[PDB]
A paper describes a structure:
[name] (OpB) is a two-domain, trypsin-like serine peptidase belonging to the S9 prolyloligopeptidase (POP) family. Two domains are linked by a hinge region that participates in the transition of the enzyme between two major states—closed and open—in which domains and residues of the catalytic triad are located close to each other and separated, respectively. In this study, we described for the first time the structures of bacterial OpB from S. proteomaculans (PSP) obtained by X-ray for an enzyme with a modified hinge region (PSPmod) and two of its derivatives. The enzymes were crystallized in the presence of spermine and adopted uncommon intermediate states in the crystal lattices.
Despite its small effect on thermal stability, the presence of Sp made it possible to obtain crystals suitable for X-ray analysis for PSPmod and its derivatives, PSPmodE125A and PSPmodS532A. The partial restoration of the catalytic activity of PSPmod was also achieved by the alanine substitution of Glu125 acidic residue from the β-propeller domain: PSPmodE125A possesses hydrolysis efficiency toward the substrates, from 19 to 26%, of PSP, demonstrating increases in hydrolysis efficiency (kcat/Km) over PSPmod by about 6- to 9-fold. According to our previous in silico modelling, Glu125 also participated in the putative interdomain SB network and its alanine substitution increased the activities of PSP toward BAPNA and dibasic substrates by about 8- and about 2-fold, respectively. PSPmod and two its derivatives (PSPmodE125A and PSPmodS532A) were crystallized in intermediate conformations, which are characterized by a disruption of the catalytic triad typical for ligand-free enzymes in open states, while domains’ closeness resembled closed states of ligand-bound POP. As a result, five, three and two bound Sp molecules were found in the structures of PSPmod, PSPmodE125A and PSPmodS532A, respectively. Sp701 is present in all structures, while Sp704—only in the PSPmod structure. The second and third Sp of PSPmodE125A occupy the positions of Sp702 and 705 in PSPmod, respectively. The PDDF profile of PSPmod has an intermediate width and reaches the minimum value for PSPmodE125A and PSP-Sp. This is consistent with the minimum distance between the center of mass of the domains and the maximum value of the buried surface area found in the crystal structure of PSPmodE125A compared to PSPmod. Analogously, if the differences in the SAXS profiles are determined by the ratio of the intermediate and open conformation in the solution, then the intermediate conformation dominates for PSPmodE125A.
Residue numbers in the entry: 2 to 677
Amino acid sequence: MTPPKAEKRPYPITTHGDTRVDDYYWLRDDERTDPQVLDYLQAENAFTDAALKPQQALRETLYEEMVARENLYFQSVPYVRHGYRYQTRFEPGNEYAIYVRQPQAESEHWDTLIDGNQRAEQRAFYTLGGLEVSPDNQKLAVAEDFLSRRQYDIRFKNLSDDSWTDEVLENTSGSFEWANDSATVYYVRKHAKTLLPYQVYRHVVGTDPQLDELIYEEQDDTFYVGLEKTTSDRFILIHLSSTTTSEILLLDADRADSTPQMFVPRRKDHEYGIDHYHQHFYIRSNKDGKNFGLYQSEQADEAQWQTLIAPRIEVMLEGFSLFRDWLVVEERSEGLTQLRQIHWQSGEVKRIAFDDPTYTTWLAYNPEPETELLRYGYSSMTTPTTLYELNLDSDERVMLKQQEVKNFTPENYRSERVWVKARDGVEVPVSLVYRHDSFARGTNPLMVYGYGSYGSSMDPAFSASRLSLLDRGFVFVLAHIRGGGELGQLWYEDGKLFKKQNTFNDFIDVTEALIAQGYGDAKRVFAMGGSAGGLLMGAVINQAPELFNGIVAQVPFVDVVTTMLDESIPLTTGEYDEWGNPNQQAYYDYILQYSPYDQVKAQDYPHMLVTTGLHDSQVQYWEPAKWVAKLRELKTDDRQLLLYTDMDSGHGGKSGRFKAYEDIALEYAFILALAE
């Protein structure tokens, strides 16, 4: 079977001095119009369809496995907020959810806030970006996208008679906050071209959208604009944030005249985020360390910040929650997430204990501070995702809801925390899981997942889909490679920019170790990763093709240099502090040397499935497309290279959820076939 050969159109870049010829630069089209591009993608999709056609039997098997353990009757965990209990209801034969609420003192009746299906009537796309009731519980602001271009139209509704307002606020990010008069909101506007949150406008609910005065214009290109509100309900915060630096202006939520009040001016490498409660500010700042500390102050002035939790080399401070008698904080240490409660008055401390070798715990939704009930999540590789409600005074823990998993008995699966000494001497943590009865050291197929970017952690949690693999001899693995945030800020900074090469080394080292230690079969080694995890993939294969038999590169970021050079591509402006700006010989040199597209050599590669989305936009469909074209011309091997490009538009990971389960069946079948 001859794979599709793309038309070679030489296009030289030439930056700083050295020239890169890109044969497949023409594959980029920002409108998705070009028939000649469409053809290559259709051709490549058609080839994929043909190669994977005998696996249909398995795909359907896996699809129904993964669907028949998920209740189509899905209610949420109800939360109280402003005296009303709020729940989301999914029911079969209905694509979008129904959001309901009831008086906190009420049981019998439930009121419909917004029905997605009703709003979806007569429209081609629907995605709910935001939904929040005004402080007085009379009005309902909602951020909806009826065109699905990641750009939301805010509308207001009166819950008394379910009547809507005249006006509609357009071109927003969906991020808004009510003022305490319940007739005035601030909202974040994107630019007409760049389409990145940079403007904050004040609207008076029921007035003209033209007469919505601009409040703040964020000039610095690298700074994302956001809107939070404090626990005190006193200040609406304008949270400016780049990847290293941050700034916070305050808006008086009680006065209808309030200009942004400078909290603490932005300083390079000082990331801070605030809250307000008990007539105090509570700040999480990295001014005295990478790992962050919690600080208290009467006013904004940085000098006046008292230290509550000083930064440490060994414990990352991730987040916090305020309550009447207790402070509760999110922390990591030794590759485990953990929680702590600290009494404001007494100073008493209580850790929350857990046996599991590979688990994740986190702070859940706690909107009302005046309670002794903490709400925190938990998940592991053997235990479904679970929400608990702990009484901070009595230590009594009640489980509010589990993840519902049918045809699943937990005792069938073993999990392990394995450390691996990397080439440079650094201990890299690993969270693996396998089926008890299928295991036999050195025979089992091995799937190594990894991300390792932005300081994002691949914390060991539960996966219902993963059971399809485990129940076929597989040992699924999470590699907590540098670039993620599993071992704190240091772990991220040691896996980005000039130390990005550590990410890929860490991945290869973990896989080799696990093979050497007999966790998996050395012939049937497989890997997988998405977006920045697809960058991981594209590099790993270039440098260590021998290791893996098969690969799944999801929506991969493989054309690193060219993409980061070209400003017109969105996301690029914020990612300068991640990979680097190749408008510097320094970063150009380093980035290029791992950049998977620039590093495609004429050698053997593993079996590979590259996936992408055309009309999703923020995937960059061409990066994988070009990458395959080049892999096809250069690779020396007989093994299969397939490119599936999604040609849809609507939905994503919910409502049109089943598309997401089709894609995983496609990929799992692919791997399973190779692993036979």
